[PDB]
Structures are given as structure tokens and as C-alpha cells.
């Protein structure tokens, strides 16, 4: 008798698709063809942060736009002073397979996680002068792919167990669990208002969650392969996903559907990291073709290229003030661009 | 807070990083792969938590063995983390012929994985003492699962082991033939498979890994120095 509700779900998905199509009056290209092109964007490597041993899987900027934490698969977090390339802290990790790192918006804590299935929280502002593990968030049955601080006591982690979990750092338990994805949730992006976040999973779907009620608001299924990167548009009304389809896609939360596709026939390799500029006009996208690609977020044009890395570009972060873009890679170097 | 005292701190951190690069370079990282029926865990003890790490030393050389556990069935994403690893220790249950076919498919995906194209595989055909009994008795044979076993005969390499039934040799070298066939027909010369015969208790396994990792690094050096 489950076939009846299976057909119900099929007709429901058809209803969603038809509603999305009926709301599709004009593409983003048709509306922004009449605006000035961004033009040739040329960033150059202002800083090169050296010191990581193995490949770099993740970076996160501090909210001060000067400090950045970097995660290396040698089992080390390094806090960098990007202005002076000074290593502020070198945090040795219990597990050598960290796949994500986060900076608390207050700057007091840094989170990391990876194949150990644990979101380790490190307190940078100890009175003893050493960075020590404030908490270890166990409870995920898969590898941790992303973590993002909401406050100094809340953090949402995405895991390879097809589940996103909201955590309480003081308690150490999952306040909420998001269980909609059918594949490894690879990326995670917090909305600027922090009330929502989006997830990208290997099931090619992107889901929008409410961090409070634990409800998946919307589901987006534009891609064809695993979504490796996700980032919110600066106003929180849209997000961009980068997949193994060698394609970046822009989705609108209110339109509930895809806006643009950022693909080039010359590129056939998956996107590892994705980010926006401060105004959201530039869509930076890391690739395993060893180089990042600057995109025109409104016209889907390749505005520029960041080609300073000698291995797969794994992480990518634009400062909160929008001054620079840092780009870590599997060659163990971060690069600050401007 | 002087900047000159922060650069001194950053230089002291670099000094800690450089002496941690010495240990990282001198250590050898290994990835254990294999199914539940394969004696992967028994090898570990004879030499939620999502990764298990075993550190063993052979001839003053540090080996870091990374048994992966408490993950999902799909591994196309976290296997990228193990690129630029010294070797992959693949362990196979050679006795269970029904699950043996899935071991070749598991081995096939590892060998042709885009991120493990430069990583050699140290194959450990485990529980070969159980494999001898399963073919000496003759109750269950390989032809029931592999039709090409009847047309297979022992090659010039004829089991220089002290004493074993020729059917044991024919069967156990047929399992190698299936596994070596994948590593040769479906791969380049960038990485080499290293088949081995392993029992439930075999203290020689750490030496086999050391010898085979010595050859894997040897061919890295033969390519680093362009002597090839």
C-alpha cells in the first residue's frame, strides 16, 4: 500500500516543479543582459602563508578580516595574521584528518572536524596562554565535512552521515538534528541573519533549514552530482552551490529554484569551494584544476582567474570586509588575493 | 604589544613546525581497507569514532596505519583525504568465495579511483589457512562462483612454500591472478599492487609492509631522481 503514497509523493514533486515553472517569468541573464559587465578582474597574490605540512582542507576568516584559521591534514590548525603572515597560534589536533575548520564570530573559539566524526572546539582566549580543547562534540556517525559557529555556544555541523546537527557547546549534545539529506552532506553555509542555513549533500540536492524549528524549509535539486561547496548570497535571499558537475549554480530561496548556471566548456572538473564577494557581484569558485575562477554572479561570465596554486584548491574565503580572498590548497599554501 | 615580539613568536611557531615536519616526513602513513569478513581487525592487533590509528615501528621506521571505521557504506568522498598516502593495505577474505567477488569490485574501485592513481596497494589475502581447508575438503570450490577456474593451471611460479597440496596452490594463486589482473589491465604504471598471503596470526606482516613500503618509496625516489 506504500505505492499509493509513493504516487502521492510523485504528484507532489510534480506540483512543486510546476509551481516553480509557473513562477519562472524570465531568467537572470535575460534581466541582467542590460547592465554593465564586470570586466577583467585581476587579483594577485598579496600574501602566501607557508608552514602547513600536508594539504590544506579548510580555512575560515575571522570576523575582523585579518585573522584566519587554517586546517591541514598533518593534524594542525594554524591561526594566521594575514596582514603580517605571522602565525598567531599553531594548534595540534588529536586527529590528523581534519576536513573543516571554523572561526567563532567573536574570535574566542575555533572549531575543527574531519574523519574522526568529532567537532573539536578550541578556546583561543584561555587565561593559561595555550589553545586547549574546550569541548569535543561527539554524536555524528559520519565524517564531519563542515562546521559553522552561530554564537560562542552554538555550532551547526554537517556530517557524512547524511545529517546536519545543531549543537550546544556548553552542554555538548545535539540541540537539533537535520535529517533530510540522502547523501553525505558536504558543505554548509550560515545565513547572515543566522536564523537559517543551507546544506549541500552528495545526493546532488541543496536543502534550506531553520536552525530553530529543525524543519527543512526548501529543497533545491538543480545539480547532477555531489555538491561540494555552498555559500549564501550576502543578503541571505540566495545561495550558490559548487558541484562535481564542474558547475556553480545560483538558487533563490524565495523563487525556490535555480537562478543561474556558472559553467564553462573549458572546465570539466568539480568545484571544491565557493564564495561571494562582499556585494555578491563576484562568485569566487575553487576548482581542482589547481586554480580558482572569478565569476560574474549576475551574468555568468568568467570575470577572472586566480591561478597561483600548484595543487587542488580546497578552501576559499572572502573577508567580511571584502578586502581580500584567501585560497588554501592541497599544495599546503594559503594565498591572499586582492 | 610590539610587533617584533610577535614575529619572534611566529618564528618560534615555525621552529615547532619544522621539527614536526621531520617526524611527518620520516613517518609513513598507511590506509587499511577491507570488508568486515576480511581479517582487517585481526591484522591490527597482530602488529562513533570515525578513524582508528595504529602506530607501529619496523627497523626504526615509523608507520602510521589508519583503519577507517564508523563511516557510511559510500566512500567516494572521504577517500580523497588519503591521496598522497604511502600505501593502501587492502585485506581480503580469500576463504569466502561468495563475498570474494565483491572484494574484486571493492579492489577495482580503489585501484581506478582518481585520487589513488599514484598510491600502491599492499594486498593482504588473509586467512589463507582457512582457504587451505575449504579446498582440501572439496565441499565448496571456486568453480561454483568463477567459471574460469577450471581452465586455470598453476604457472611457472609453483609455490616454493615448504609443503602444500597442489590444489591449495592452484586455488590461492588463482585468487592472486584475479586481483593482479585488475591492477594491470585497469591501471597505469604509476602504482603497483603487492599481493601477499596472510594467515590469522602472522607476525611477518609488519615486515612485509616494511619491505613493500621500502620498494614503494624506492620507485618514488627512482622518479624523483629521474632514474627510470
Amino acid at each position: 500500500e506504500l505505492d499509493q503514497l509513493r504516487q502521492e509523493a510523485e504528484q507532489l514533486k510534480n506540483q512543486i516543479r510546476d509551481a516553480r515553472k509557473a513562477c519562472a517569468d524570465a531568467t537572470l541573464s535575460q534581466i541582467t543582459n542590460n547592465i554593465d559587465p564586470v570586466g577583467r578582474i585581476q587579483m594577485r597574490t598579496r600574501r602566501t602563508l607557508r608552514g602547513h605540512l600536508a594539504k590544506i582542507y579548510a580555512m575560515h576568516w575571522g570576523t575582523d578580516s585579518r585573522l584566519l584559521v587554517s586546517a591541514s591534514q598533518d593534524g594542525k590548525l594554524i591561526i594566521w595574521d594575514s596582514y603580517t603572515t605571522n602565525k598567531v597560534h599553531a594548534i595540534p589536533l588529536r586527529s590528523s584528518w581534519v576536513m573543516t575548520c571554523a572561526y567563532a564570530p567573536s574570535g574566542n573559539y575555533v572549531a575543527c572536524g574531519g574523519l574522526d566524526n568529532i567537532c573539536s572546539i578550541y578556546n583561543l582566549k584561555t587565561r593559561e596562554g595555550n589553545v586547549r580543547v574546550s569541548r569535543e562534540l561527539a554524536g555524528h556517525t559520519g565524517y564531519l565535512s563542515c562546521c559553522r559557529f552561530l554564537d560562542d555556544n552554538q555550532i551547526v555541523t554537517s556530517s557524512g552521515d547524511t545529517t546536519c546537527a545543531l549543537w550546544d557547546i556548553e552542554t555538548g549534545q545535539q540541540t537539533t538534528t537535520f535529517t533530510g539529506h540522502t547523501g553525505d552532506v558536504m558543505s554548509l553555509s550560515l545565513a547572515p541573519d543566522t536564523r537559517l542555513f543551507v546544506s549541500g549533500a552528495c545526493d546532488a540536492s541543496a536543502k534550506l533549514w531553520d536552525v530553530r524549528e529543525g524543519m527543512c524549509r526548501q529543497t533545491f535539486t538543480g545539480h547532477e552530482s555531489d555538491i561540494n561547496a555552498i555559500c549564501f548570497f550576502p543578503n541571505g535571499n540566495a545561495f550558490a552551490t559548487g558541484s562535481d558537475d564542474a558547475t556553480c549554480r545560483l538558487f533563490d530561496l524565495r523563487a525556490d529554484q535555480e537562478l543561474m548556471t556558472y559553467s564553462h566548456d573549458n572546465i570539466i572538473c568539480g568545484i571544491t569551494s565557493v564564495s561571494f564577494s562582499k556585494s555578491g557581484r563576484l562568485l569566487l569558485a575553487g576548482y581542482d584544476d589547481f586554480n580558482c575562477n572569478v565569476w560574474d554572479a549576475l551574468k555568468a561570465d568568467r570575470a577572472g582567474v586566480l591561478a597561483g596554486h600548484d595543487n587542488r584548491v580546497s578552501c576559499l574565503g572572502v573577508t567580511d570586509d571584502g578586502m581580500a580572498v584567501a585560497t588554501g590548497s592541497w599544495d599546503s599554501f594559503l594565498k591572499i588575493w586582492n | 604589544a610590539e610587533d617584533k615580539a610577535a614575529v619572534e613568536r611566529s618564528k618560534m611557531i615555525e621552529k615547532q613546525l619544522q621539527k614536526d615536519k621531520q617526524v611527518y616526513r620520516r613517518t609513513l602513513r598507511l590506509l587499511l581497507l577491507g570488508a568486515d569478513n576480511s581479517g582487517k581487525s585481526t591484522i591490527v592487533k597482530q602488529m562513533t569514532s570515525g578513524i582508528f590509528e595504529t602506530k607501529f615501528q619496523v627497523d626504526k621506521v615509523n608507520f602510521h596505519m589508519f583503519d577507517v571505521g564508523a563511516q557510511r557504506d559510500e566512500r567516494r568522498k572521504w577517500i580523497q583525504c588519503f591521496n598522497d598516502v604511502t600505501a593502501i593495505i587492502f585485506v581480503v577474505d580469500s576463504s569466502d568465495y561468495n563475498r570474494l567477488q565483491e572484494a574484486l569490485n571493492d579492489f577495482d574501485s580503489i585501484w581506478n579511483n582518481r585520487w589513488l592513481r599514484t598510491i600502491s596497494v599492499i594486498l593482504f589475502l588473509n586467512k589463507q589457512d582457512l582457504l587451505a581447508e575449504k579446498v582440501l575438503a572439496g565441499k565448496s570450490k571456486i568453480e561454483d562462483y568463477f567459471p574460469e577456474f577450471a581452465r586455470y593451471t598453476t604457472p611457472e611460479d609453483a609455490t616454493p612454500e615448504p609443503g602444500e597440496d597442489p590444489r591449495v596452490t592452484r586455488a590461492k594463486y588463482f585468487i592472486r591472478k584475479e586481483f593482479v589482473d585488475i591492477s594491470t589491465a585497469s591501471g597505469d604504471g604509476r602504482h603497483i599492487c603487492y599481493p601477499h598471503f596472510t594467515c590469522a596470526v602472522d607476525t611477518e606482516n609488519a615486515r612485509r609492509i616494511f619491505n613493500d613500503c621500502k620498494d614503494i618509496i624506492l620507485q618514488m625516489n627512482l622518479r624523483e631522481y629521474n632514474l627510470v
Partner: single-chain antibody
Amino acid sequence: VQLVESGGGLVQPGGSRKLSCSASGFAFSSFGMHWVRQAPEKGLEWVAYISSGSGTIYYADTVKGRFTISRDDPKNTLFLQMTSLRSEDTAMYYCVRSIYYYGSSPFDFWGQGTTLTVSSDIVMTQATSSVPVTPGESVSISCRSSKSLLHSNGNTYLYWFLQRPGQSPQLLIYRMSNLASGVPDRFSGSGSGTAFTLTISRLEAEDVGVYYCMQHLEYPLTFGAGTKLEL
């Protein structure tokens, strides 16, 4: 966090003594360590400095070549050797915990102080020397420097301290605008490059003490005379 200094007592001028500070409760190896003496009924005076890892070592001009600030990280003990003591060296020798990175707060913890009794530089001037006042009403303390403490970085290397009677100085404001840890938000530092003002919003019974200022722009570090606050 705890710094305890040993050594002192009556010393003849034609002799010598060695001061030691045992550190406990923090990663002593990762902290630069300062010696700051305080002559009886006088202001603080910076004596010596040793960086983390026993690298950069500095001395005061009045003491260079005579004292030796040694450090033994494994025992978490800081030393200070004195070769030929003088009557001017009579002071309570504080030992200060200081760490330097972006956003750091050096001079944040001071030792309880050991007493030794013997039988150019950026001059910091605190024009006011005593501000008698009642609790409740805001109090402002001002100081001036010989040259601008506003570095090209964008931060003003000015540090405010408070030595309550019968106690050790404690950090209130670091880099002229940053409240220290455990300090109430009543205190507030201001200034542009040469004139600095510390504004206590609602002075309480614990604010009675001497409020020193110190520059960290260049060595030697120089303290002001300190403005006492009567009650």
C-alpha cells in the same frame, strides 16, 4: 595563573643576590617575562625582559651590564641575577607575565612581589599626582608621553595599570583602548597619540590605588609616576 618570586632581604652593596620567580598555572614557556621593580613609595620601573624561548633579551639603561635575566623553561622558573648591587636597587621586584601576538594582552598578570633591600627613553608624565574623590562619580586620569605612542600599525602602545594598596599592579587597559580580562567596564581608556585619559565611570571601594601608565612602543618600557586616588 600564579607567579611567586623568591629571594631578597638585606644585602650589602658589595655583594650580590639572585632572584627567582616560580611560575604556575600557565604555559610559562610561551610567555615573555618582565622584571619590574618599584622603589619604596616610588613608581614602577621596568628592569629586564626575556622573550619566549630565551631569545630577545632587554635591560634598562640604569641596569644594563649589571643584571642578568636568566630563564629555565622546564622548571617554569624565571631568574634575575644581580652582580654588584647598589643602594638604588632597593625595590620590590615584581615579575610580569606578557605574551605578544595580534590581539594579545601583555603585562596582564603580575607576581605578588619580592622585596630586596640594600644596606632616548620615552618619558611618561602623569601631571596629576592625587585625585581625592567619593564613590559614585566618574573619575578621569590623564597622562602624557614624550613622543607619539600611535604606531604606523594603527594602535597606540599605552597600558594602564592599577596597584591597589598592599597588592600588585594589575592590567586595566592595554593599547590605550582595550579592557583587560576580569576588569569591569567602568574603566575606559582614550587618547589619540600623546594625551591619554582613563575614565572610571562609577568609582567603587576597590578603585582606591595608584594608576600607572606605561608605553610599550620601544624599549626601555617607562612608567609614569602614578596618580594616587584617595578616598
